[PDB]
């Protein structure tokens, strides 16, 4: 008559580490580290990302001609921007601020296009040959920014002081977008804006801007020498912008009212296909669909997402040394 | 091991005990079986669910890196951001992948300890009236039955009842 | 005849947390987190803090005509600015730099107000006339910035070339403050400096300032459609200043001596009561009087402070699991 | 408990004993009585305050927030600040959280040890003059007075003095 | 210390015992001598070994601080820079200083253990053939020549090949 | 017949704390922080450092008529600048953007000198008395910046339109510096490029500047109340600089072909001798030699060093208790 203590043993060949001994195998044990991904983007919240396909951010908000399919009102839970995308600044020169420009998209959810300043606002100048060949639409060889009017004068009358407002009587901010042309030389500067000195300036109750034309010859992009200075700003709710100037003015034409996002802002470079699918959380390069509590998948995503780390393996032993006779 | 238990004086696991992590194999007249002790097993269990289930808890923030670029004229504030989040990056690989091996070798030792302690236990009750083989097996002096079994197992072992049997036949 | 092997008992209640067990009664135990605050602040080394009251940063070393309380030299342990505060930048415009501002000051602990640019200084001008129903006194409608000299032309004259020039021969930094006027229209323009281009321009061994007036009408803010373009520095010791300007100058007239504070610097945004007490520790939600390792109050805070973190509480078992009989 | 000792073979404590943290309760002819064993809960306490002392010592630095402002076209190095702070109250919210788990679960060990090898250090001097009831108890199988106890309790217990006597009432 | 050994019933070391960190002490007709228990002193080597190694691994990232110099108007980056980088700094520090000093006492107590379970382990060899001094020395009841000896050393210890003759010895 | 167990003694006084217990003495033990260095620089990779001696990094890339031991091409495996370096800006005036500078020099590894654009670009001007007594060689008492040409007019003819142009056809980027020139006074300014607005204006596919004089005198230093605004910039591969100026111009002479260090950068500022040496950790204020895991020396290092903490001793016990007898 007999009686033993012992333990359990399985046929596990389930090993973990420990600060003694490497490759213990265990009866039980948990990976915490999840390292799997659909290789893919899916909605978050059922709410599905914008893709801003062929055009970048810049070409999106500026209205490149050839964006049109991303026109007018956009909602997302997060931005896909193509690497490659060839459709941006058509016509040369520096979109101002644009990293802060980008954060300050990426912080919102939705944008409502209207039409900010109508080509009526305009007094004394030309409001119909505002076209380039830098800047072909898909059916048109010369066209230019949808959300922006390049002012020229009357066939020979000289450009006079034009002016515009606009009240924000909404509960929402407002991004806006105008320009300042620099000619290459002083005769295409007379030839669209006459002479003398020329100014542009805008300003609200916490905003001020002054910019002059900077004529001068610069190396050919897209077949020009001239440049123009794009800039953005936000009229908040309440504000109110005048605009002033008397020539080398791209003014603001539509306008975007702003949906600033309560929750996590995200915008992937990315080349993965959007399918239609559902998510909780979204790494850029892939989703992950997981209870585990790490992931080595990508430190950049939105919605609730794992704790990412560098180890390719975080398992813990629940049982105890796995010991099978014989 | 540290408490000498599992891979110590009990050279072996049982694969024929499939019910708990800790038990019992006996031998009597009505034959042998394994049986696992529901007490110790079950108290394991919680203790070590609650483990994972703490350390789960305190791992449950993120650190979340930002999509955010940087100029040319802005490499000072982009390397900033880059070995700030490499800094944590690094710091929370280091607290997962130290607490992970502190916390297996504290766990094995747990299940070390526990199988120390059933034997002990057995071992308090049985004193005299078996022979201790040196395995986590004792031999009985007497005719110990089921309910005799059970008795040792729920830690109700009658050692007085067993006491001159158990005399006469160790003498 | 007996003996027995045991361990102590008592009658606590309180519990402690483990990796394996959670409320676990132990006899004895230590709370490591402090959670109380006293709502008020108090001095720090027995220095008091600056209460700016119903002026701002800007309205306090601008010299904001309604701040004459806080006006001239001031010592702080730290400062605290109310929310509501109404007085800062009366004349509307824009402080250049003003986050930079804000954290110099900060870092300071004593300002010594002096007189830097007598009205003496600028020749062949008016520095009587300078005032505006946008920054009132609490007697007079019309005043202005007790720091600032707003500088017009002789009654039909026109604007000289003005000059000054202010070497810091002290051992301490100088702060400093002065302005560039930028009218609605050219009739405002020509009626304050005359006709032709106008300049603002300073420097110093390591400053260089150039500035012209921008003239645009933006909306209407304190009854006013002109701006002030405010602007500050630093004169270093052994530094000078030179200031020349044709017109639109907003000169400065008294600056301050500023004392670096060797410590840690703070500035508190809250409505907290100042009272006549001491502290070791001020956060900016209240005073912590305890010996405790860590603390859930605020991450804010100057002088010596327990560590913040978001726990609720943090107590270590001492004695042993507490398991009286009966 | 790991060592099997508190809330294990010895099921519950003294409220009795209120001077230490291990000790004593004997019975004799002179009566009955709790007594600390000094050496072994001072020692307790000596490292017990270490510890607390060791994880206060630690934990004396602190990560400053500022006050410091951005503005509408400093959103990012704005952003960059905000997650630092988070980031660092993350990491120190973790590390205090997870440390005085860990701690609470190894001090409860050590007190649990303490008991146990108090336990063992009685065994060890009585050998089979004393009977082990099991529970921490042993009886005396001679007449243990005072200063027996007190011999005892202070590790000079004289086995041979009472072996003969001992052996007599034991067989 | 924890498991009782260690300056506890063996109250000190062995200077004489040079080529391990366990082992044992013999007396018998050929003399005496120390002999380190090599299964048990290699195991310790290569586990303390893979401490050592993996909190080296652990800690082989480094953040890195920056010579970027800042303007006077970019005190706020420049702070935002200064306060990062103390902080990974105090963070560092504390992982490394609280570490060392928990693994220093888990590693005192691993020795410990070590050394009770090698006093146990012989302790069950023996049985009642030998005589329990309580200082981890045992007193044979037989002649135990350098052959006898080494079967205690290894495990394979012959009870019953003794047993009468230390019955009669003991009795 | 006897047989004991028991454990290792020895004579080690080497002490460990522990959590419980502090001074513990120990049979074995490893220290695992470093705390010496060899005060001194050596060679990374073989590699030796530039070091900049009596010229600061201004001065170098400059190309200060005093720094000519360092003129031309240059290979580094870090950057060592004194701290009491006396040649760096020698007429006085601002380099714009110098930290980001710094911080882009610190990321190379080499720079190679070439001419960008020889005196013979600038046509219609002088390219031969561009010097000063603020800048003297060691030989001349008026010389001028080897990177930079000082134009002036033609002893009476009028300043003209200078134009330059340089296309980066190579495959590295090009770090090159320009200059526009701020005169006391307008007396100074038509003597030097006579009368008329002047303006330098500089652009690439990427870049565009603009910059016109401003007129004003300044503290005197070095002899000098004119100042000069430097600039610098980044010529990608494959990328064109047009220059265009009336004036006021100093142009970019020799650029340097710039290459980008794979690794991490360093820039030590020390008084510490580089000598004959070869490294594999080099530390801001010294060498380490060392297997150890951590270091106090310094969190300033280049190379692979330790990791830097505040400590100063970390030792892990790997013996046990040492208990020798008697
Ligand atoms: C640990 O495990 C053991 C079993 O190994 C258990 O002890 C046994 O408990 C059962 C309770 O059911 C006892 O069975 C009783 O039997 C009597 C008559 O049996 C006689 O024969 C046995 C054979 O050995 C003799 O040893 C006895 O002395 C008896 O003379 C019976 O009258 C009694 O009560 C009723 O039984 C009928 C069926 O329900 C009912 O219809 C009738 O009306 C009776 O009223 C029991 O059936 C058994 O004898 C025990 N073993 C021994 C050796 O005595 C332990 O269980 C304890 O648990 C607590 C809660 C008590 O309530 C009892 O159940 C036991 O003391 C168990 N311990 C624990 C902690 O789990
Ligand atoms: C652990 O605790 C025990 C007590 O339980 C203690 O052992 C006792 O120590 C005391 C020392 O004071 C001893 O008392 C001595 O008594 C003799 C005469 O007593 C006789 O009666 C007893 C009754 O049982 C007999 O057993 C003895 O054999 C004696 O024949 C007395 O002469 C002696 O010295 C002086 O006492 C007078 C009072 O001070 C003085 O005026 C006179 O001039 C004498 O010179 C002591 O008083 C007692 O006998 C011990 N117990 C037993 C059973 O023998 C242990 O204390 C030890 O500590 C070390 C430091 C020694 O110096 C001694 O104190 C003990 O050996 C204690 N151990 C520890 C480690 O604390
Ligand atoms: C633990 O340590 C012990 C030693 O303390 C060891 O046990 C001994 O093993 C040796 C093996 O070499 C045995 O020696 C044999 O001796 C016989 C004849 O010896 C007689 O005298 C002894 C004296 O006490 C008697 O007790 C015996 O009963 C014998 O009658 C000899 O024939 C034998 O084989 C050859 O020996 C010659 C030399 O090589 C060879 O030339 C000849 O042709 C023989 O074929 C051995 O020499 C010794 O007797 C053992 N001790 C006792 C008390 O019996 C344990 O070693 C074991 O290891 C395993 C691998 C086995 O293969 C054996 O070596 C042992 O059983 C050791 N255990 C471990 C785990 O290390
Ligand atoms: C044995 O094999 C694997 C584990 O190695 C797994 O399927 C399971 O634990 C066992 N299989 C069965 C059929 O029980
Ligand atoms: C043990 O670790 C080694 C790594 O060298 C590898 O073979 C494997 O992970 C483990 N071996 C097993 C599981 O047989
Ligand atoms: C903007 O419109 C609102 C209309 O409710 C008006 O009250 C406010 O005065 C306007 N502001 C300006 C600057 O015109
Ligand atoms: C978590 O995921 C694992 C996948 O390995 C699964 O086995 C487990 O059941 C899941 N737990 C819950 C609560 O869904
Ligand atoms: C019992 O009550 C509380 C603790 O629960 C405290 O006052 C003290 O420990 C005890 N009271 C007294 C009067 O001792
Ligand atoms: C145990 O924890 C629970 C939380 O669910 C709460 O009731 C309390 O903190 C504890 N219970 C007690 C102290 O009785
Ligand atoms: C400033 O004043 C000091 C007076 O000690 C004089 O030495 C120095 O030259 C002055 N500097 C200037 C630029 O006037
Ligand atoms: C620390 O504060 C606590 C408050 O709970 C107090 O009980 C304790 O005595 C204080 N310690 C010292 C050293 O002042
Ligand atoms: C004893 O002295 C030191 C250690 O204290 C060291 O030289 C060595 O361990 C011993 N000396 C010799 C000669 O063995
Ligand atoms: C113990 O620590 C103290 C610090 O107060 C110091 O004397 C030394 O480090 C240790 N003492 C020794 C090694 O004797
Ligand atoms: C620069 O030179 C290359 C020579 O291969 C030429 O193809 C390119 O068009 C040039 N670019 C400009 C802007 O002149
Ligand atoms: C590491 O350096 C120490 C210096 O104390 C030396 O004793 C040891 O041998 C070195 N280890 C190796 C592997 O070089």
Chains 1, 3, 6 share one sequence.
């Not at chain 1, 009686?3 to 948990?30: F, P, R, W």
């Not at chain 1, 009357?154 to 924000?168: E, F, L, Q, R, W």
């Not at chain 2, 289930?53 to 004229?73: C, G, P, R, Y």
């Amino acid at each position: 008559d007999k009686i033993c203590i012992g333990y359990h043993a399985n046929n596990s060949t389930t090993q973990v580490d420990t600060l003694l001994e490497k490759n213990v195998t265990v009866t039980h044990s948990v990976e915490l580290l999840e390292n799997q991904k659909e290789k893919r983007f899916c909605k978050i919240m059922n709410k599905a990302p914008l893709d801003l396909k062929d055009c970048t951010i810049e070409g999106w908000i500026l209205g490149n001609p050839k964006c049109d399919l991303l026109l007018g009102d956009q909602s997302w839970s997060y931005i896909v921007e193509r690497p490659n995308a060839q459709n941006g600044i058509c016509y040369p020169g520096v979109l101002n601020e644009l990293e802060e420009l980008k954060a300050f998209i990426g912080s919102g959810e939705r944008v409502e296009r209207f039409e900010m300043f109508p080509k009526s606002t305009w007094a004394g100048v030309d409001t119909s040959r505002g076209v380039t060949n830098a800047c072909p639409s898909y059916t048109i060889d010369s066209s230019f920014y949808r959300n922006l009017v390049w002012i020229v004068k009357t066939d020979s009358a000289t450009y006079p002081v034009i002016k515009g407002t606009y009240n924000n009587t909404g509960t929402q901010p407002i991004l806006y977008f105008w320009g300042v042309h620099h000619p290459l030389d002083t005769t295409v500067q007379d030839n669209l804006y006459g002479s003398g000195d020329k100014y542009v300036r805008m300003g609200t109750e916490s905003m001020n801007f002054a910019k002059s034309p900077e004529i001068a010859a610069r190396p050919a992009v897209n077949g020009q020498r001239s440049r123009i200075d794009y800039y953005w700003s936000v009229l908040r709710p309440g504000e109110t912008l005048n605009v002033e100037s008397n020539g080398n003015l791209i003014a603001p034409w539509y306008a975007y009212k702003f949906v600033s996002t309560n929750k996590k802002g995200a915008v992937f470079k990315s080349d993965l296909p959007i399918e239609n699918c559902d998510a909780t959380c979204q790494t850029i390069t892939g989703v992950l669909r997981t209870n585990k509590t790490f992931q080595n998948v990508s430190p950049l995503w939105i919605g609730e997402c794992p704790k990412y780390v560098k180890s390719e393996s975080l398992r813990l032993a629940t049982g105890l040394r796995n010991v099978p006779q014989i | 091991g540290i408490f000498g238990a599992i891979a110590g004086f009990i050279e072996g696991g049982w694969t024929g005990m499939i019910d708990g992590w800790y038990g019992y194999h006996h031998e009597n007249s009505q034959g042998s079986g394994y049986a696992a002790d529901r007490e110790s097993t079950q108290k394991a269990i919680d203790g070590i669910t609650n483990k994972v289930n703490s350390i789960i808890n305190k791992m449950n923030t993120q650190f979340e890196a930002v999509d955010h670029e940087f100029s040319n004229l802005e490499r000072r504030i982009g390397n900033l951001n880059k070995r700030m989040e490499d800094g944590f990056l690094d710091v929370w690989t280091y607290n997962a992948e130290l607490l992970v091996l502190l916390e297996n070798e504290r766990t094995l030792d747990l299940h070390d300890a526990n199988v120390k302690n059933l034997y002990e236990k057995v071992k308090s009750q049985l004193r005299d009236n078996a022979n201790d083989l040196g395995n986590g097996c004792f031999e009985f002096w007497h005719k110990c039955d089921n309910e005799c079994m059970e008795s040792v197992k729920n830690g109700t072992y009658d050692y007085p009842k067993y006491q001159k049997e158990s005399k006469l036949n160790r003498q």
